[PDB]
Design a protein around this ligand. Structure first.
Ligand SMILES: CCCCN(C)C(=O)c1[nH]nc2cc(O)c(C(=O)N(C)c3ccc(N4CCOCC4)cc3)cc12
Length: 207
C-alpha cells in the first residue's frame, strides 16, 4: 500500500466540499455518471482504429449498485479505465487548474452544482461519501485500487479482488445521514432529472 499527499489545491477543494453548507448534494451522481460516460466515449473512439482494444470486453455500459448492508453506492462502467500514472499523477496534475478556477468562481457567486464546468466533478463524491474507493483496469496496465477518506492523503495498491476486465468502479462509502442515495426511488428520480440523455445503458441493480 502506497500513501500519497494530494496536490495542495485538491486537498483545499476536498475540505471546501466537506465543510460548506450546501443542501443540493444529489448532483454528485450526475458528475460520476458523466465521468463514466466520458471513459466509455474514449474506449469507443479508440476501438474504431484498434478493434483489439475491446478484447477486454465489448459491452459499453454503466451499472448503479446500491448496498444497504455495506452502506455503499457503487458506480461501475466498462470505459477505458485508468493507469497507475493517471491515479497517482496525471489526473491530479490536470485538476490543479480547474480546482483553482472553481474555487475562484465560488468566491464570485458560483455554487457547488457548477463543479463539472471546471473538470473536477469527481470530488463532489465527498458531498455524500466519508470514503471513496476506486477500482480501475486499463488495457495497458494492472488492476489498481485507489482510496481516500480525504484528510489530505490517498492510497494506491494493486487490487487482488475480482478482475474487472476493463473499466472503473467507484465505491461510495456513504455518510450515515446520506442513505437516501441507496433508495431505488431516489436514484431513479436523480438519473431521470440529470442523466436522462446519457448515451449508454444505465442499469440500476435491485437489492
Ligand atoms: C485520480 C483521480 C481519479 C478520479 N476519478 C475516479 C474520476 O474522476 C472518476 N469518476 N468517475 C469515473 C469513471 C471513470 O470511468 C473514470 C475513468 O476511467 N476515466 C478514464 C476518466 C478519467 C477522467 C475523467 N475526467 C472527466 C472530467 O474531466 C476530467 C477528466 C473521466 C473519466 C474516472 C472517473
Amino acid at each position: 500500500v502506497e500513501t500519497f499527499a494530494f496536490q495542495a489545491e485538491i486537498a483545499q477543494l476536498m475540505s471546501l466540499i466537506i465543510n460548506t453548507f450546501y443542501s443540493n448534494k444529489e448532483i454528485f451522481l450526475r458528475e460520476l455518471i458523466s465521468n463514466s460516460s466520458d471513459a466509455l466515449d474514449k474506449i469507443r473512439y479508440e476501438s474504431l482504429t484498434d478493434p483489439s482494444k475491446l478484447d477486454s470486453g465489448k459491452e459499453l455500459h454503466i451499472n448503479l449498485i446500491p448496498n444497504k448492508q455495506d452502506r455503499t453506492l457503487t458506480i461501475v462502467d466498462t470505459g477505458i479505465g485508468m493507469t497507475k500514472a493517471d491515479l497517482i499523477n496525471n489526473l491530479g496534475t490536470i485538476a490543479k487548474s480547474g480546482t483553482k478556477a472553481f474555487m475562484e468562481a465560488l468566491q464570485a457567486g458560483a455554487d457547488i452544482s457548477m463543479i463539472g464546468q471546471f473538470g473536477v466533478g469527481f470530488y463532489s463524491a465527498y458531498l455524500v461519501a466519508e470514503k471513496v474507493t476506486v477500482i480501475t483496469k486499463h488495457n495497458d496496465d494492472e488492476q489498481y485500487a485507489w482510496e481516500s477518506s480525504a484528510g489530505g492523503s490517498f492510497t494506491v495498491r494493486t487490487d487482488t479482488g475480482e478482475p474487472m476486465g476493463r473499466g472503473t468502479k467507484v465505491i461510495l462509502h456513504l455518510k450515515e445521514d446520506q442513505t437516501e442515495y441507496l433508495e431505488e426511488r431516489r436514484i431513479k428520480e436523480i438519473v431521470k432529472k440529470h442523466s436522462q440523455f446519457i448515451g449508454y445503458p444505465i442499469t440500476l441493480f435491485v437489492e
